[PDB]
Amino acid sequence: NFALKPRMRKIFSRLIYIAQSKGAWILTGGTHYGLMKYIGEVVRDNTISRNSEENIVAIGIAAWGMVSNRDTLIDEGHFSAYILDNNHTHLLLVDNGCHGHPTVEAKLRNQLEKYISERTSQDSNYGGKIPIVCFAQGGGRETLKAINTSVKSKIPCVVVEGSGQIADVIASLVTSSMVKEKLVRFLPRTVSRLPEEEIESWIKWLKEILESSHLLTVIKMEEAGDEIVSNAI
Amino acid sequence: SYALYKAFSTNEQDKDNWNGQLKLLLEWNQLDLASDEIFTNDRRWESADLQEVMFTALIKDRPKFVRLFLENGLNLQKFLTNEVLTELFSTHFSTLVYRNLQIAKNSYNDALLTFVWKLVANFRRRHPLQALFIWAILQNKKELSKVIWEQTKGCTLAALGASKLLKTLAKVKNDINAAGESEELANEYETRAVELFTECYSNDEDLAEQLLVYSCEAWGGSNCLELAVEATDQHFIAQPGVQNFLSKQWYGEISRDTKNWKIILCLFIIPLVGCGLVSFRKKLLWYYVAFFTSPFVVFSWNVVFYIAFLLLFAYVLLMDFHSVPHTPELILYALVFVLFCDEVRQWYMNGVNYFTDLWNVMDTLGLFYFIAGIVFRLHSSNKSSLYSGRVIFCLDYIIFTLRLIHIFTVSRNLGPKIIMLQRMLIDVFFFLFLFAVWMVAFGVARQGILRQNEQRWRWIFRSVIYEPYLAMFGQVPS
Amino acid sequence: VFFFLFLFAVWMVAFGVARQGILRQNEQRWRWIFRSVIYEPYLAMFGQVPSDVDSTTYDFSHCTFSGNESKPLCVELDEHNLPRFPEWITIPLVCIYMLSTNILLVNLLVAMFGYTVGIVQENNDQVWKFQRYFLVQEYCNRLNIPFPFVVFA
Amino acid sequence: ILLVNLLVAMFGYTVGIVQENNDQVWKFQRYFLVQEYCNRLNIPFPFVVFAYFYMVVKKCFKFRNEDNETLAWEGVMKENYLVKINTK
Amino acid sequence: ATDQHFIAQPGVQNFLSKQWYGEISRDTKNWKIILCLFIIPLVGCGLVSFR
């Protein structure tokens, strides 16, 4: 389940417009749920608007244990009804053991991000090096795991908003006392089910987040018009 | 509402019933509270049992709630059955709108209103969103209609058809408040259709011209370009996109950015079709035939043929008219046979509404006078019949000459003025009314003061009507 | 002016050919076709009211009976040497033409002139003082004496 | 004098009204003639009867993907125009 | 008072028209009405509304 208020709608439409203007890849999960659905639909909208002139690339990265229908070939197949999204032009699915295992895709994804980070293509304005930006808006464990695995690598350029669940606490906190102070007031209903033996681990996760605050930035409240996405990236 | 929600939310056996919370904030108009406390944490939804509340949001006028719901997900055809339509039209559709619908069908029948009368007769007893948009628009809901219109695919066809329906229901002359309100909503949706098509023409012209010609799998059994004509939505056709389309279909192969005197010069001498003075963009024998199949040049050939026809009819009627038909009269009869078969062809194509326009009436009437002139002409050796035939041909030449005004309405210069000419009828009739009153009041008085007991009917009207009529051109009765 | 002349030429021809065909029979002289088809309905715009349609004020002294001398032909006669043309079909024809050209078609031209003057007056002074430049330059582009001695210059 | 010069005034006022509607009504009426000349596949007029014989020849012998493509095209500028509405 | 803006409003004009026609409905064409005046026993037919 995913709620998408029109602020996020405007921001992500402006984002995919910027990524079409610059010729960038967008890495995402790629399922048929919520945000990945909406990103794929805006990809299809820009695909049908101009039809050509530097089309966009949306790589989805899935788990292979959550997939409804799996058809092994060499020969194409038809996926019908986690459900995959339609409009991602490239998909990649990680291979592992049994079915019900999330967070398997994060290792290969973060290693790929590190390799494009250390890759050098001189025909740019960054000084080669292919600049990489991470975004976070939603909530959950995998968001914090992604942000900390990103910021552990040098230069992730993590951007968050003041809109979401974990985006609220990361925007509004800027030690353990203040961590718990914001965490009990902005998300009580998830922490109603969570043991303390990993809440101290989350305090360590956010400690490694706030170790490098210069590599993090935030879209604030009163930047609600146009060009707010370019001024963040 | 906020007090009732704060008491209902803090019972601790009702936190699990978020459906009751949603129905509570649905009956009242709490939008910000529902958005902030029902869909915010995104822990619980199913997108499939949100239907009855959805139906509730359709029946007690909640456009912002159904916008908030469709923002979070539903397919409307999955929501729609025929039973929803029978509830909406048999029960939720008011009897007053039904009464004005029957009055509008009896007083102002159209093809689209006949179609909607058919479908309301169907559903009181495949295009789902258009049907619910129809129900929203005849019920004058005015804000749910925008919410469903933003979800439709064939948007401009929907806007134009809704403008047609609402103008036709606005012509009804009882309950003038409903008439004015539906009139304003008609103006709003025709403005919306024009302002959308100017954008989708200002980006891409070819796909816009594809939009203009697609029938949308029998929306109302018509086209996007046809609904603006049937509604008399003449502001939709006065915009530069549709006019650019009409000009590019009117010229045919010839480019628009050339001067027209070159075009009529290449019409005047045929083998100048193969020269570099005319652009044929939008081989040589194909240039020849694609030239001769353009609409512009077949019209400008037909008018030259018509002027040559009038000169031949004048030469026959004035200078060569004997007791038996000579060669130019027979050539003339062949030309009128060609004109007659073309007119009966377009009458077979058009139908009974051909008789609606007055120019078609007087064309058929003139051909009838011509065949009457023939059957008075051929009975020779009767001087009365042979003279009456020529009188009928003169009074027919009047009609065939006055057709030329209607012929030359297409030009960029004379055209708007000839169209303007028919707006003067009420001033001409007011002038003729006052002049006839003063004419009779003077003529009878003068004829009664001067003379005594005229017993001839002709010299009553020659001296009561005719001489005061001539006294409008400065004759001064003597 | 061209719209006025177009409508007046159409009504002129449609009346002139009809009147010449109803009255007379087979004019074989080209000059007396155009004198009686084009010229007399043209004069009927200045209030002349074409005369040979009355069958009471029509004397046979101005006829020819055959095209020999100057004058027009007669209307074609009866067996009783009477005019054949109906008064009830030529008098209202002249009345309709005379109304439609001498009154409606002129007073429409007055309205169109009034509207064009109502438009072009704020552009009039700008276009005039734009055209002033050309005459000022072409008189300042000559170094000469006043005109009858210019040839010496 | 009075009754004619009143007609001149009423003509002048009606011309003063209807001129901004004149071009719209003219180019609306332009559609019908453009269509009725484009609704015929024939030669120029004095041989049309032979082409009519060709039509007599007829009487003598006898979901879509690009549609969804252009509707999906239309929806993009619909979204852009709704943005242009609430941006006002 | 010669308050002719009070009578030029659509309510008073609607009242005057509904008192002027009488029994005949306003949403019919008037040529039917003068046609039923021209021939008397067409008063009993279904072409005119007498509401």
Numbering used by the authors:
A (entry chain D): 154 to 227, 232 to 238, 251 to 343, 350 to 408
B (entry chain A): 409 to 533, 558 to 714, 722 to 917
C (entry chain D): 867 to 1019
D (entry chain A): 969 to 1030, 1045 to 1070
E (entry chain B): 663 to 713
Original paper wording:
Transient receptor potential melastatin 8 (TRPM8) channel is a Ca2+-permeable non-selective cation channel that acts as the primary cold sensor in humans. TRPM8 is also activated by ligands such as menthol, icilin, and phosphatidylinositol 4,5-bisphosphate (PIP2), and desensitized by Ca2+. MmTRPM8 is a homotetramer with dimensions of 140 × 110 × 110 Å. Each MmTRPM8 subunit contains multiple domains, including the N-terminal four TRPM homology repeats (MHR1 to MHR4), S1–S6 six transmembrane helices in a domain swap configuration, TRP helix, and C-terminal coiled-coil.
The ligand-free MmTRPM8 sample was obtained by adding 2 mM EGTA to chelate the trace amount of free Ca2+. The ligand-free state TRPM8 structure represents the full-length structure of mammalian TRPM8 channels with a canonical S4-S5 linker and the clearly resolved selectivity filter and outer pore loop. In MmTRPM8, the selectivity filter is lined by residues 912FGQ914. The backbone carbonyls of Phe912 and Gly913 along with the Gln914 side chain, build the ion conduction pathway with a minimum atom-to-atom diameter of ~9 Å between both Phe912 and Gly913 carbonyl oxygen atoms, suggesting the passage of hydrated ions during ion conduction. In the maps of MmTRPM8LMNG-ligand-free and MmTRPM8nanodisc-Ca-icilin-PIP2, but not others, sphere-shaped density peaks were clearly visible in the center of the selectivity and tentatively modeled as Na+ ions, the cation at the highest concentration in the sample. Distances between the putative Na+ and Gly913 carbonyl oxygens are ~4.5 Å, too far for direct ion coordination, supporting the passage of hydrated ions in the filter. In comparison, in the MmTRPM8 filter, the Gln914 side chain does not form a similar hydrogen bond with Gly913 carbonyl from its neighboring subunit and the atom-to-atom diameter is 1 Å larger than that in MmTRPM4. As Ca2+ has a larger hydration radius than K+ and Na+, the different filter diameters between MmTRPM8LMNG-ligand-free and MmTRPM4 may partially account for their difference in ion selectivity. In comparison, no density is observed at an equivalent site in the structure of MmTRPM8LMNG-ligand-free. The previously reported structure features in bird TRPM8 structures in the ligand-free state, such as low-resolution pore helix, invisible selectivity filter and outer pore loop, and one single straight helix formed by S4-S5 linker and S5, are not observed in the MmTRPM8 structure in the ligand-free state.
